[PDB]
């Protein structure tokens, strides 16, 4: 036997998924996103006021880039268009202490506010490398947005669009 489950499901995103995308990045090029999350069809995903990130962003030589580096998560509507009203997690790079912050409640770093993503909406991870630094690679890097395995950390909440009578309201 199996136990029934709700439509809401708790997950944790990362690099090696299909619907997410990525690309390499060079120094001094903030407008080039290294990660492009993209809403699947017939799905909504939700993020409450605070959810962790694991912003691993290393060099080709597997070294975290300069602490002067900065990360900006950013919501985007359709049209592949950035948006300012609606933005999460403006931070540096040189502040995470990767090896612990993936684990510890205090080193953990959450969002600024909540978020919702319709069937087709983009989110981008812009990376301000100052200049003259080492280039970015993605295969030597990871990323997350939730801690669903643990018991103190939050996680991403996915729903199928069909399973709602408030779907029209959340579409508005």
């Amino acid at each position: 036997n199996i136990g029934n489950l709700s439509a809401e499901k708790q997950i944790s995103l990362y690099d090696g998924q299909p619907f997410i995308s990525e690309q390499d990045v060079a120094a001094g090029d903030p407008n080039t996103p290294a990660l492009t999350i993209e809403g699947p069809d017939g799905y909504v995903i939700a993020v409450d006021a605070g959810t962790p990130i694991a912003p691993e962003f290393r060099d080709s030589n597997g070294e975290k880039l300069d602490p002067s580096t900065r990360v900006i998560v950013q919501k985007c509507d359709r049209q592949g268009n950035p948006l300012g009203d609606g933005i999460i997690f403006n931070d540096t790079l040189g502040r995470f202490n990767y090896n612990k912050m993936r684990t510890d409640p205090d080193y953990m770093r959450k969002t600024a506010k909540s978020l919702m993503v319709d069937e087709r909406e983009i989110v981008k991870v812009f990376v301000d490398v100052p200049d003259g630094a080492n280039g970015y690679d993605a295969e030597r890097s990871r990323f997350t947005l939730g801690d669903d395995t643990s018991d103190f950390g939050k996680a991403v909440e996915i729903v199928d669009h069909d399973d709602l009578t408030e779907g029209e309201t959340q579409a508005v």
Partner: protein, 229 residues
């Protein structure tokens, strides 16, 4: 009459007959099975509950490396390596990420340094020409899921449809309250309604070699349950 208990990759509550171990498919990646859990003669039922119940899984692979007169000391691996809980300092990893053993000299082979994300390693010692060495790095870059069987092979389906990765598995430090694992899922299975774990990955897996030094069992899976007697 509900009491919590623990399972293993070996025997225990099953006598090594109501459980099996198995390797995986590599050349075509397939979400194959490596381990099962058949209900034995006695029990009325078993229960698993992710978000309440724990899990542990320490996977390692195997290879074979010769030596040379002008031996290299250096190796590369087609299996991505990471730490477990923190740094790659073999003294304080909470268990090593690599094990090595020379075959000619029936003795360990200690490590000097690791090329971390390069997935290469430097050793401490100097192997000899035609000398064989067996390694057991950990396994990453692979998924995992659970499922169920209706006494034949007709699957009910799966516990929780979404997978989980193994580099992540290593990453989360086992042995720490709160930082423990608690997956998602809630199930029950009675006599002969066996469970089977599944894994999809390129690389192999290893349960035993009979030459692995540390305790006869290269890998393990261990788990908590809530049993009705």
């Amino acid at each position: 009459q509900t009491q919590e208990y623990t399972l293993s990759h070996t025997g225990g509550l099953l006598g090594s007959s109501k459980v099996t171990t198995a390797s995986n498919q590599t050349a075509p990646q397939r979400e194959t099975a490596i381990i099962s859990f058949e209900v034995p003669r006695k029990f009325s039922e078993i229960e698993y509950v992710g978000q309440r119940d724990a899990t542990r899984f320490v996977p390692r692979t195997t290879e074979e490396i010769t030596g040379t007169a002008n031996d290299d000391t250096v190796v590369q691996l087609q299996a991505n390596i990471q730490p477990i809980a923190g740094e790659e300092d073999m003294a304080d990893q909470d268990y090593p990420v690599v094990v090595a053993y020379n075959v000619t000299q029936g003795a360990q082979v200690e490590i000097a340094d690791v090329n971390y994300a390069t997935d290469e390693v430097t050793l401490a010692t100097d192997p000899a020409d035609g000398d064989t060495v067996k390694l057991w790095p950990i396994m990453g870059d692979g998924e995992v899921q659970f499922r169920l069987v209706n006494q034949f092979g007709q699957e009910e389906g799966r516990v929780y449809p979404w997978a989980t990765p193994l580099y992540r598995w290593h990453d989360f430090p086992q042995l720490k309250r709160g930082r423990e694992i608690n997956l998602h899922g809630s199930v029950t299975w009675q006599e002969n309604e066996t469970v089977e774990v599944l894994l999809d990955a390129p690389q192999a897996i290893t349960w035993e070699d009979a030459d692995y030094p540390e305790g006869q069992y290269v890998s393990t899976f261990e788990q908590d349950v809530e049993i009705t007697l």
